[PDB]
RNA sequence: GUUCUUUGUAAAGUGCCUUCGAAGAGUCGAGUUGUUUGGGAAUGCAGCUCUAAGUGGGUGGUAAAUUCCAUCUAAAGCUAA
RNA sequence: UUGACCUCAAAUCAGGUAGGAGUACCCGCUGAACUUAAGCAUAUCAAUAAGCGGAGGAAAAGAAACCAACCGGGAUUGCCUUAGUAACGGCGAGUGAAGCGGCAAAAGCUCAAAUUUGAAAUCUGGUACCUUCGGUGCCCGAGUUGUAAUUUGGAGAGGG
């Protein structure tokens, strides 16, 4: 919450880094079910 | 002056903030108004009592 | 909004209105004991913004701290050393009188915890402070989890270890290149930077 | 607008009411039993050769009494066990870490038939 | 074998008190004849009997005291469990687990969710 | 995983327009003295004297004047690995 | 004469807390000299040892009044490197830090300053009950010189 952005390609990279991430994860519903998802130990490794 | 102070507080005696005695008794009717009329806190008459608080009066 | 007025009015300490009060207050404090119970906070605006809450459990004490410098306790002025540290009368001590105010008050009542302090008055001989303390064994502070941290044992005698506002300033712990000697503890930074670290595999 | 007359020239605390005690619970729950009962006072009679010949002539019994006991607590413990009164009690501390007591019963009894009836003679 | 442990548990309060003087007297007798001959190992087996009956009185007497204070607060200090000084001090689980109004509103509204990566 | 309440006309989050938006004082800072620092026309601290400001204050570590820029918000507080 | 406010007190008043021990690590205060300078007065030893106060399983620090000036980064802590370096020093002996970079661990936040004023909605205590590390009912007290909710600056508040 304490850094501002001044480059478009840096903003584009970070915005693209969130759109791709949200499409590659599943959020387990609060209700129930949600079977095991074979967790991956590292998140930064999957996104170089 | 003594006369002014007596007259001033005599007006105050006619306008007193609600104590726990009346504060308890209203909520029965207020809940009864809620239970029966479902009023939006308007069944009771408008307050005209004196105010309190140094951070309030300022 | 009656608290913005006491702040700005108190900021004009040299005003004629304040000069009358301070002379009256200093006489009242002097005739009392060095440390005694402060029944009501004389500066509600200052205490309120320092963490004090005017509710059940909080108490105030008033303390008079002797004014001046720290003369060495050496006998007859002899220092028995190199001609470098031969001075006795012109040493200035390393903590503010505010820190001593907490120490002498936080030690008289051990059942309490020192929260903060502030300047109230002063004269040629003394510096007056009023210290706000909390009681962690009181059920009011035990509940109302906003102030549960004062009940933790790790906050035992906070001012004795210099963890208060004046404590963090007297020992000078702050962010910035202006504070590199003391940024994470003067001794700890020294030991961290003055030591020989030998690994298993000497590169 | 009125001030009380003061015969004295000094101020003193008025004698207020000293409130009594009313704890919510007992101090130590059950009280301790009798630490020095009639039996721990008298532990074992002395049977030495020199003590024995004092029984027959002076009508004096010798016991290894408890250290904490005193002649007030000796004169009553012995008369409750052996139902014999005591003329006087003389008590010394033995140099081995124990306490000795000479109990001289009154002329109405003799120690000879009392010493043997408890077992030692 | 002296006396046993659980047999005298069923004994009444008055009967146990009279049991001491029964043991207490015979100790005064065993001292008298112990000096007579230099062998008496029977004194040990029943001096452990006087202690057993004394112990049973306290466990029965403390139970009655404890039952009197059940339901109400401020029980006697020794009845309270010892723990350590630090554990007896500090915050109870209710006091520590308590949270303020604002932070609680955030907690239910925004809990920490669980997730993973599949594709 | 199974279980009884459903706590609630209560609480929380999102777009749009307008008006506001309070933010810590003997403190900041300056001189001087002493100590410390690698801190060098003064690194930090402490004593005394003076002692404020608001599109203000601190910093941009050779002083000073004039005019710009960048940077964050002090003098209150809690927190595991 | 009666009844309230403020201040100061009394008791073997009800309920609590603090002292001491250990100090290996941790937080500060105070604080030398031997020695090096092949003499010795600045210096170094050393912001050390001794002395003092204070805690925990870790302590401390910790969400910038930061570093940078770069296409800027972004709580704190520890390792490698920066670096025997900038700098300090009878510029002699000697002392000598920080930014950036890679790694380990990753976490955030909270008050005051805003009239809820058609509602002190806040809290302790005592008493009674109970599905009793707590909850409910009732009653004396703290409290508006201010207690809850609401926002703390990344924002956010009042209206539509």
Swiss-Prot record, chain A:
Location of this chain's protein in the cell: Cytoplasm
Source superkingdom: Eukaryota
Coiled-coil ranges from the UniProt annotation: none
Entry-annotated residues carrying Phosphothreonine: 46
Assembly information from the UniProt record: Component of the large ribosomal subunit (LSU). Mature yeast ribosomes consist of a small (40S) and a large (60S) subunit. The 40S small subunit contains 1 molecule of ribosomal RNA (18S rRNA) and 33 different proteins (encoded by 57 genes). The large 60S subunit contains 3 rRNA molecules (25S, 5.8S and 5S rRNA) and 46 different proteins (encoded by 81 genes).
Extra facts: Present with 133000 molecules/cell in log phase SD medium. There are 2 genes for eL13 in yeast.
Function: Component of the ribosome, a large ribonucleoprotein complex responsible for the synthesis of proteins in the cell. The small ribosomal subunit (SSU) binds messenger RNAs (mRNAs) and translates the encoded message by selecting cognate aminoacyl-transfer RNA (tRNA) molecules. The large subunit (LSU) contains the ribosomal catalytic site termed the peptidyl transferase center (PTC), which catalyzes the formation of peptide bonds, thereby polymerizing the amino acids delivered by tRNAs into a polypeptide chain.
Similarity remark: Belongs to the eukaryotic ribosomal protein eL13 family.
Protein name listed in UniProt: Large ribosomal subunit protein eL13A
Organism from which the protein derives: Saccharomyces cerevisiae (strain ATCC 204508 / S288c)
The encoding gene: RPL13A
From Swiss-Prot, chain B:
Coiled-coil ranges (or none): none
Localisation: Cytoplasm
Protein's job: Component of the ribosome, a large ribonucleoprotein complex responsible for the synthesis of proteins in the cell. The small ribosomal subunit (SSU) binds messenger RNAs (mRNAs) and translates the encoded message by selecting cognate aminoacyl-transfer RNA (tRNA) molecules. The large subunit (LSU) contains the ribosomal catalytic site termed the peptidyl transferase center (PTC), which catalyzes the formation of peptide bonds, thereby polymerizing the amino acids delivered by tRNAs into a polypeptide chain.
UniProt record similarity statement: Belongs to the eukaryotic ribosomal protein eL8 family.
Subunit: Component of the large ribosomal subunit (LSU). Mature yeast ribosomes consist of a small (40S) and a large (60S) subunit. The 40S small subunit contains 1 molecule of ribosomal RNA (18S rRNA) and 33 different proteins (encoded by 57 genes). The large 60S subunit contains 3 rRNA molecules (25S, 5.8S and 5S rRNA) and 46 different proteins (encoded by 81 genes).
Other remarks on this protein: Present with 238000 molecules/cell in log phase SD medium. There are 2 genes for eL8 in yeast.
Protein name: Large ribosomal subunit protein eL8A
Organism: Saccharomyces cerevisiae (strain ATCC 204508 / S288c)
Full protein stretch here: 83 to 140 of 256
UniProtKB/Swiss-Prot annotation, chain C:
Entry-linked SMART domains: Ribosomal_L15e
Gene Ontology molecular function, alphabetical: RNA binding; structural constituent of ribosome
Family annotation (InterPro entries): Rbsml_eL15_core_dom_sf (IPR024794), Ribosomal_eL15 (IPR000439), Ribosomal_eL15_CS (IPR020925), Ribosomal_uL23/eL15/eS24_sf (IPR012678)
One GO cellular component term noted in the UniProt record for this chain: cytosolic large ribosomal subunit
Transmembrane parts of this sequence: none
Compositionally biased intervals (Basic residues): 168-184
Record localization: Cytoplasm
GO terms for biological process, alphabetical: cytoplasmic translation
Record's subunit section: Component of the large ribosomal subunit (LSU). Mature yeast ribosomes consist of a small (40S) and a large (60S) subunit. The 40S small subunit contains 1 molecule of ribosomal RNA (18S rRNA) and 33 different proteins (encoded by 57 genes). The large 60S subunit contains 3 rRNA molecules (25S, 5.8S and 5S rRNA) and 46 different proteins (encoded by 81 genes).
Family recorded in the similarity comment: Belongs to the eukaryotic ribosomal protein eL15 family.
Annotated function: Component of the ribosome, a large ribonucleoprotein complex responsible for the synthesis of proteins in the cell. The small ribosomal subunit (SSU) binds messenger RNAs (mRNAs) and translates the encoded message by selecting cognate aminoacyl-transfer RNA (tRNA) molecules. The large subunit (LSU) contains the ribosomal catalytic site termed the peptidyl transferase center (PTC), which catalyzes the formation of peptide bonds, thereby polymerizing the amino acids delivered by tRNAs into a polypeptide chain.
Additional observations: There are 2 genes for eL15 in yeast.
NCBIfam families: PRK04243.1
Swiss-Prot record, chain D:
Protein localization: Cytoplasm
Position(s), cross-link Glycyl lysine isopeptide (Lys-Gly) (interchain with G-Cter in SUMO): 40
Chief location category: cytoplasm
Pfam families (UniProt xref): Ribosomal_L23 (PF00276), Ribosomal_L23eN (PF03939)
Record keyword RNA-binding present: yes
One cellular component (GO) term of this entry: preribosome, large subunit precursor
InterPro entries linked to this entry: Nucleotide-bd_a/b_plait_sf, Ribosomal_uL23-like, Ribosomal_uL23/eL15/eS24_sf, Ribosomal_uL23_CS, Ribosomal_uL23_N
Purpose of the protein: Component of the ribosome, a large ribonucleoprotein complex responsible for the synthesis of proteins in the cell. The small ribosomal subunit (SSU) binds messenger RNAs (mRNAs) and translates the encoded message by selecting cognate aminoacyl-transfer RNA (tRNA) molecules. The large subunit (LSU) contains the ribosomal catalytic site termed the peptidyl transferase center (PTC), which catalyzes the formation of peptide bonds, thereby polymerizing the amino acids delivered by tRNAs into a polypeptide chain.
HAMAP family on file: Ribosomal_uL23_A
Protein name, per record: Large ribosomal subunit protein uL23
Native organism: Saccharomyces cerevisiae (strain ATCC 204508 / S288c)
Lineage: Eukaryota, Fungi, Dikarya, Ascomycota, Saccharomycotina
């Amino acid at each position: 919450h304490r850094r501002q952005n001044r480059n478009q390609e840096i903003f584009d990279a970070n915005v693209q880094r969130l759109k791709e991430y949200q499409s590659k994860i599943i959020v387990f519903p609060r209700n129930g079910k949600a079977p095991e998802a074979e967790q991956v130990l590292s998140a930064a490794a999957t996104f170089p | 002056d003594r006369n002014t102070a007596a007259e001033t507080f005599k007006l105050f005696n006619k306008y007193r903030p609600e104590t726990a005695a009346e504060k308890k008794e209203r909520l029965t009717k207020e809940a009864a108004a809620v239970a029966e009329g479902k009023s939006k806190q308007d069944a009771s008459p408008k307050p005209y009592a004196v105010k309190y608080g140094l951070n309030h009066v300022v | 909004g009656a608290y913005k007025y006491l702040e700005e009015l108190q900021r004009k300490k040299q005003s004629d209105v304040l000069r009358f009060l301070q002379r009256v207050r200093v006489w009242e404090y002097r005739q009392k004991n060095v440390i005694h119970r402060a029944a009501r906070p004389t500066r509600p605006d200052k205490a309120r913004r320092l963490g004090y809450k005017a509710k059940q459990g909080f108490v105030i004490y008033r303390v008079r701290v002797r004014r001046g410098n720290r003369k060495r306790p050496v006998p007859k002025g002899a220092t028995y050393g190199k001609p470098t540290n031969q001075g006795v009368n012109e040493l200035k001590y390393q903590r503010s009188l505010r820190a001593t105010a907490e120490e002498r008050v936080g030690r008289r009542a051990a059942n309490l915890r020192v929260l903060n302090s502030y300047w109230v008055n002063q004269d040629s001989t003394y510096k007056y402070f009023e210290v706000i303390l909390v009681d962690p064994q009181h059920k009011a502070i035990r509940r109302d989890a906003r102030y549960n941290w004062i009940c933790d044992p790790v906050h035992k005698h906070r001012e004795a270890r210099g963890l208060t506002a004046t404590g963090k300033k007297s020992r000078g712990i702050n962010k910035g290149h202006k504070f590199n000697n003391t940024k994470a503890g003067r001794r700890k930074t020294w030991k961290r930077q003055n030591t020989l670290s030998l690994w298993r595999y000497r590169k | 607008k009125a001030l009380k007359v003061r015969t004295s020239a000094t101020f003193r605390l008025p004698k207020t009411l000293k409130l009594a005690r009313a704890p919510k619970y007992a101090s130590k729950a059950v009280p301790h039993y009798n630490r020095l009962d009639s039996y721990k006072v008298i532990e074992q009679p002395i049977t030495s050769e020199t003590a024995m010949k004092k029984v027959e002539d002076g009508n004096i019994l010798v016991f290894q009494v408890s250290m904490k006991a005193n002649k007030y607590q000796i004169k009553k413990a012995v008369k409750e066990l052996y139902e014999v009164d005591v003329l006087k009690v003389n008590t010394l501390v033995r140099p081995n870490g124990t306490k000795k007591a000479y109990v001289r019963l009154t002329a109405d009894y003799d120690a000879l038939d009392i010493a043997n009836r408890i077992g030692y003679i | 074998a002296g006396v046993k442990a659980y047999e005298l548990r069923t004994k009444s309060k008055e009967q146990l008190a009279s049991q001491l003087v029964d043991l207490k007297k015979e100790l005064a007798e065993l001292k008298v004849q112990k000096l007579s001959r230099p062998s008496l190992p029977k004194i040990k087996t029943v001096r452990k009997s006087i202690a057993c009956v004394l112990t049973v009185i306290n466990e029965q007497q403390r139970e009655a005291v404890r039952q009197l204070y059940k339901g109400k607060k401020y029980q006697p200090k020794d009845l309270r469990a010892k723990k350590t000084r630090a554990l007896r001090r500090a915050l109870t689980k209710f006091e520590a687990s308590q949270v303020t109004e604002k932070q609680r509103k955030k907690q239910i509204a925004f809990p920490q969710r669980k997730y993973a990566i599949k594709a």
